[PDB]
């Protein structure tokens, strides 16, 4: 139960660290149109980032951004990759 | 669907419900490999998906919207156009 | 004569909508090194975005970002693609 | 071109001249397909182009800088490294 | 020098801007490791250390406005290089 946001917050905080997480999956040959499968990778990336924020003893993560790639092998999409990153903060 | 969305933050009091994401895509016909205006549809669809998620979380709108885009190639031709939209769902006060 | 910016503005406004535009061109075989040809696509993307801002009855666009792709056909760059997007606002 | 540039905004009074963009690129030799440190010079070139455009618009500097990057492949090898830089040219007060 | 702050967003505090800085880091995948996108973790760390060292050479206190670009570079129809670019604005407080 730890907060996450794309932008900053108007409140007093100190900065613990910037954290990053990558998650990925492999597509079946028949599923090369299934870009909806990115949904689970964003949620996995967030949970990895939140766990890292909790290990740093922060209250949450500001400044979240995502990078995405669709990686091709032998002229077909084969991997979907999300990178998430943000700044872990502690309020006051 | 009457719910606000913005690329940046807002100077107002809010609480943060959650960050939400949506992906939309389409498959190009062989003759339409030059039709990058077809991304318009996908940005619209991504926003609708995001707004629906904001409404299920019982927020007033979405701040901090960004889009990632890909043109995915199959056997040396563009075949899919993909938009990912994401942002922070907030509740005012 | 309508303003556009990458960041927000410290002033009172209401939000009309987020708008997006895509611009693209096809490279000749001999022009696969000509990445300066993105310049005109950025300008076209802005003009499309401004047009949309004016249709929504806003004063300008905050939060502008651009995505870019170089799309390959048969192992050569063939299309240059810009996506522009931002938030249309009305001052006060 | 002793002229300021930043990724974020500034807490100060300004007016907005325009948004500006610059692209810079280079071609890799076959033996240099692992040399991604060669992006270094392209970022610098992109900044120089953006600053020169800011100076033509008679601004004091550039806020909101972002970069897009691509590694463009020809016949299944990286051949071009491409940087796009863009930002908002401002004038203080 | 070692312990220097870095953040994705700005800070609500008084500062002057030294310069914008950039770093790139990369690695080459083995054929058997074309699924190993976890290996980006290293590259983000390396990119940050390069950026911090540039901030320290400019005599700043830290880096605001950090962003990362990423690419997965293919050679002969397989992923061969993972590339991170990091960039941000080096500042000095007061």
Most extensive interface, chain pair and sizes: A-B, 27 and 28 residues
* CATH architecture title of chain A: 2-Layer Sandwich
CATH topology (level 3) name of chain A? Translation Initiation Factor IF3
CATH class of chain A: Alpha Beta
Give a short account of the largest sheet of chain A: 4 strands, mixed
Taken from the alpha-carbon principal axes, the silhouette of chain A is elongated
Task: State the fourth-level CATH superfamily of chain A.
Answer: Hypothetical protein apc22750. Chain B
For the terminal residues of chain A, how far apart are their CA atoms? 19 Å
What count of helical segments of chain A does DSSP give? 1
Across the major sheet of chain A, the strand order is: 1-3-4-2
Share of helix of chain A, binned: 10-25%
Layout: helices, strands, pairs:
5 copies of one chain form a homopentamer.
Chain A: E1 3-4, E2 13-26, H1 38-55, E3 60-72, E4 77-91
Parallel strand pairs in A: 1-3
Antiparallel strand pairs in A: 2-4, 3-4
InterPro entries (chains A, C): UPF0145_dom_sf (IPR035439)
Protein name (chains A, C): Heavy metal-binding domain-containing protein
Describe the structure in your own words.
Chains B, D: InterPro entries: UPF0145_dom_sf (IPR035439). 5 copies of one chain form a homopentamer. Helix content of chain A is 20%, strand content 48%. Chain A has 92 residues and is of the alpha+beta class. In chain A, strands 1-3-4-2 form a 4-stranded mixed beta sheet, with helices on one face. The longest helix of chain A has 18 residues, at 38-55. The relative contact order of chain A is 0.36. The interface between A and B is medium-sized, with 27 and 28 residues.
